[PDB]
Amino acid sequence: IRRNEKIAVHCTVRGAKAEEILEKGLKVREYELRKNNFSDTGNFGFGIQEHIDLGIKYDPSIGIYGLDFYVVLGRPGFSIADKKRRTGCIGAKHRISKEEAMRWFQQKYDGIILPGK
Amino acid sequence: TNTKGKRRGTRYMFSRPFRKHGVVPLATYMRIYKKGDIVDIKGMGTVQKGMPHKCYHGKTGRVYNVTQHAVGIVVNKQVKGKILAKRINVRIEHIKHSKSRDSFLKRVKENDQKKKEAKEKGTWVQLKRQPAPPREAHFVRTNGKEPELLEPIPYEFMA
Amino acid sequence: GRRPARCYRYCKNKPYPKSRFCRGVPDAKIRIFDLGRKKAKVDEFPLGGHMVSDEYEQLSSEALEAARICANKYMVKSCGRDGFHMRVRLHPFHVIRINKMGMRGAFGKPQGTVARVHIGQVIMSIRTKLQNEEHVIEALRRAKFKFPGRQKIHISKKWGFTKFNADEFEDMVAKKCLIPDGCGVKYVPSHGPLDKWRVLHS
Amino acid sequence: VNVPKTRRTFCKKCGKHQPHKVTQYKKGKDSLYAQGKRRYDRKQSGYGGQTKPIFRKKAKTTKKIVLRLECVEPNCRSKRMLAIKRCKHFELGGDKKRKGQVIQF
RNA sequence: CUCAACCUAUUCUCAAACUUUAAAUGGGUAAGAAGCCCGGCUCGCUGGCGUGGAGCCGGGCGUGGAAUGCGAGUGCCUAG
RNA sequence: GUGCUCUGAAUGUCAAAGUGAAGAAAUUCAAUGAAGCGCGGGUAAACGGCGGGAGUAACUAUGACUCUCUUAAGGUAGCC
RNA sequence: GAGUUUGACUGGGGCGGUACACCUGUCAAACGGUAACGCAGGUGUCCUAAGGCGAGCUCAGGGAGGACAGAAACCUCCCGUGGAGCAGAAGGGCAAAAGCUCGCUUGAUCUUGAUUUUCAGUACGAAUACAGACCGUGAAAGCGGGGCCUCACGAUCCUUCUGACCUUUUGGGUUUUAAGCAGGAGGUGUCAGAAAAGUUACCACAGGGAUAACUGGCUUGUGGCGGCCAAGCGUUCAUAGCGACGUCGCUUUUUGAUCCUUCGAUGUCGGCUCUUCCUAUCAUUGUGAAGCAGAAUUCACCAAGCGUUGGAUUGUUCACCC
RNA sequence: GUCUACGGCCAUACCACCCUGAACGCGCCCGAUCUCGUCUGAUCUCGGAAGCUAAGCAGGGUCGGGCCUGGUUAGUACUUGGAUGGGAGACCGCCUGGGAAUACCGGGUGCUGUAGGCUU
Ligand SMILES: [Mg+2]
Ligand SMILES: [Mg+2]
Ligand SMILES: [Mg+2]
Ligand SMILES: [Mg+2]
Ligand SMILES: [Mg+2]
Ligand SMILES: [Mg+2]
Ligand SMILES: [Mg+2]
Ligand SMILES: [Mg+2]
Ligand SMILES: [Mg+2]
Ligand SMILES: [Mg+2]
Ligand SMILES: [Mg+2]
Ligand SMILES: [Mg+2]
Ligand SMILES: [Mg+2]
Ligand SMILES: [Mg+2]
Ligand SMILES: [Mg+2]
Ligand SMILES: [Mg+2]
Ligand SMILES: [Mg+2]
Ligand SMILES: [Mg+2]
Ligand SMILES: [Mg+2]
Ligand SMILES: [Mg+2]
Ligand SMILES: [Mg+2]
Ligand SMILES: [Mg+2]
Ligand SMILES: [Mg+2]
Ligand SMILES: [Mg+2]
Ligand SMILES: [Mg+2]
Ligand SMILES: [Mg+2]
Ligand SMILES: [Mg+2]
Ligand SMILES: [Mg+2]
Ligand SMILES: [Mg+2]
Ligand SMILES: [Zn+2]
Secondary structure, eight states: TTSSSSOOOOOOOOOOHHHHHHHHHHHHTTTTTOOOSSSSTTTTEEEOSSSSSSSSSOOOSSSOOOOOEEOOOOOTTGGTTTSSTTOOOOOSSSSOHHHHHHHHHHHHOOOBBBBOO | OOOOOOOTTTTTTTSTTTTSSSSTTTTTTSSOTTOOEEEOOOSSSOTTOOOOTTTTTTTTEEEEEEEEEEEEEHHHHHHHEEEEEEEEEEEEEEEEHHHHHHHHHHHHHHHHHHHHHHHHTTOOOSSSOOOOOOOOOOOOOTTTTOOOOOOOOOOOOOO | OOOOGGGGGGGOOOOOOOSSOOOOOOOSSOOOOOEEETTTTSSSSSSSEEEEEEEEEEHHHHHHHHHHHHHHHHHHHHHHHHHHHEOOOOOOOOOEEEOOOOOOOOOEEEEEEEEEEEESSSEEEEEOOOHHHHHHHHHHHHHHSSSSSSSEEOOOOBBBSSSHHHHHHHHHHHHSSSEEEEEEEEOOOSOOOOOHHSSSOO | OOEEEEEEEEEETTTTTEEEEEOOOOOOOSSSSHHHHHHHHHHHSSSOEEEEOOOOOOOOEEEEEEEEEEEEESSOEEEEEEEEEEEOOESSSSOOOSSSSOOOO
């Protein structure tokens, strides 16, 4: 690859559309992402190797592309980090740890962390 | 040997003090300067416009002209065997006032009020200042105790 | 080959280290500055003896290596192999120049490095037990024979290679103001965190 | 350098910023009846050889580039010389450079 | 676990073209009547304003506002 | 290569004069094209000039032999 | 055939370099200034944006994750005082910047003076404050007459172009032409700016010890000759004899370095001849030591009284052999 | 006793973690019809007011790190001027004046301007 080309296509999705598309991705993952996809800042993500499984029907012109999901997770009051006027940092006990990220995931999607290995 | 560039040798004098970089504080911009008053010339290096020459850094002149952002100053410069008054246009980030002339003016006003009070009250009071007289014979109490005996120490080699 | 050291004995040329501006400098002859049993802790070797200059001059790395070698050999065949630790306290950072074998374009080229020593300055130090003191003094004298100037042999009032005196040393150790680690010691001031005092003082 | 074939600057005749078309000034050909040329021919006639210096050193490698600006107004179409710094390669109205394009394979 | 890398707290020794700090000696300016303080007038500059700034016309204030020493200023011509 | 010399044919460049055109004229432009130069041959008892690197034979060494970049020729017969 | 030229600086000239016009750091001794063929480097450019505004962002680096993807491809979060970038040398400066990304533009325009820098307080170049126009940008305050600052460049004369319903073109008038006035450009890099190849052993003149080629003098790197320490050698044994790594000296019989004396002249290699001196002693006198049995030899001491040769080859000093 | 808005000096104000916050306020927060911007009303812009101090913010704390200010280092290092001082030199002592900087040991940790609020 050489610089200033075009390599990736990405998109940012938030809200009800985000939770339902995340619901579809975990339906593909059968609500199982195993050990260490959770970053230490309380975010996580995974990859999907083929998109047609869920959702949209395959189109013969469109390829067979895979993709990856990164959910960055928050808490009400996190917008002070990107507020323009009187910006601040969010505070120590308002952060998201790996433990509470896993706890929220399995409480909201009754999923399974820590498989047999 | 060396060049005749305009900032030769100004590695340290046109630099900022340690942990004093960045934004220039605004009081230096909102000072006022009337034509006739005494200003020090330093010449910070955050501002590159209107900056004085290195011969005028650390000098003192009086203002003869005020413009939008700068001031014309009359400074004495010593060329080889004469002193002559140069007229330089320097900016207000590079100048500041003179507390020497300020102190002189406040002791002028003190002298004037003192002469007025002396004239109305009918006395004669001292107005000049005198250079640190000798030391006015006095007694030194020992407070009963004997002065401590001091004595040079022996030599020991540490370092 | 190498000039006689009397051509470069005196400090007169405005310290000249190898840097960006001085390139192509050969390696100094002294590469090992510590010798003997360097892992004895603090109290295996309580006695320290220094060899300290009394002249302002520069010593060559060749002379430093020669003195280190002969002092090491005398200490080895006198106090045993693991009975001492010596550090030379002088690194040859000043580069000396040579002009080529008239005076046009005469700025020389780097041929060696010397260490500039001051009047009160330690050249070498040996730490050993308290009963090998005469052996330390003899080793430092026989190493003193390898230098141009005048040097003095002096036993320090301090414990080994530390900066604390031998009389107040064990009391500081017992009251835990001075914690041993490695060849030296750490000083514990009473103004850290109390949780640090709690993982200590216990 | 690369300067565009038109710009908008002061026109002294109308005392006003105006569009000017920009060409490159070329030195004209000699008059043969200019007074220095007349004096030079008068001096060079007869015997005596070369009577003025001939330079023959040529230290410079570039020239200052002069732009002829013409005011586009149909009534006042006055001209004006305008000079820029030295340049080896001069371009008159080339293609503008852009910052995002894939440069280069 | 032996060794590493790495990290952390220490330790030995340095810098004309490094530096937080930082002298001694040094460079400039000030130490009054061309100053001080009252009135009034002019302005096409400045302006919320009787503004601000500058200039000008009057008036009154001498304890001559550190030490020490000393008469100064000023022009032409000019050799080596 | 530098000289010297020969060929001139269609042939590039090439001064004065002459010719045509524009203009009111000074003047300008165009066509016309001598020698020379350029282009093409010759000439060294003209001036002069006349190469490197590898590996290759039953001890070893060399290199008849080969492979190589290579210039206008790569120093021949002799001689040291 | 004629006339002329054939730079300068220079640890003599030449050769080599440019220290010849400039810029950064150092030297440089805390104002400024400050030399050397001092040190470390750069310049004769580059840029319609890399100039001018406005807006919005944050950089290098690291950590943790995410299909292919691993040390490196792209996405996300956190830490990140700048450790990045700002055309280039270096120094300074700079973070809702001066960096990066967009939007709009041409203040890189037309003018008079003042000032600073080098400085003689001349010029050029570069720069700084204003003032008068016409504009750009931004909601605006403002900012902008090139490049964030310190370098990036050039007189007279001549040529060329631009401007003035301009002046003159000689007795008047018209029209070409020419001259003039103002502002750019064509260049002098020896960069305050001749137009310039050698050789002289056939040489010349004015000079120069301001300056080389001897001696002498300072120095002693180099040469030569000594000393101190003792790791080793010496079958053993540091020191009979030696002495590695180091280090202290002396000498002026080597060669350098320097340029003080001498260029209105100190005769310039070697040999021959002849005298005298030195000692750092080869022999001989008197001794001490030995790894001194004798003989031979080696190491020291007092010691320069006395002697130290004949030849081959080479101009040789040196050398080598009989 | 405090807070908002705009500040001045620009860490005694920063950084790390912990506790408390009455009332106004400042925020977090709800939404995208209009204005205006995005891949995404997350940011920016607009329209609100159900809930909340969780966070920002404020105050306090830490034998806290930094920073500020003293002591020590130390009349040490260095230095002005002087000598027919010493020393073979290298350098050193003295006379006359000036006089630092680490390591180590204390104390402190935002003052304050203009305008407008709350606190019975
Ligand atoms: Mg210099
Ligand atoms: Mg320089
Ligand atoms: Mg500028
Ligand atoms: Mg020197
Ligand atoms: Mg012809
Ligand atoms: Mg032939
Ligand atoms: Mg042959
Ligand atoms: Mg031969
Ligand atoms: Mg200076
Ligand atoms: Mg000075
Ligand atoms: Mg901005
Ligand atoms: Mg405007
Ligand atoms: Mg203007
Ligand atoms: Mg003319
Ligand atoms: Mg010149
Ligand atoms: Mg002389
Ligand atoms: Mg010698
Ligand atoms: Mg020698
Ligand atoms: Mg042996
Ligand atoms: Mg001489
Ligand atoms: Mg001399
Ligand atoms: Mg002579
Ligand atoms: Mg004579
Ligand atoms: Mg004679
Ligand atoms: Mg004679
Ligand atoms: Mg003798
Ligand atoms: Mg005799
Ligand atoms: Mg603290
Ligand atoms: Mg004193
Ligand atoms: Zn016009």
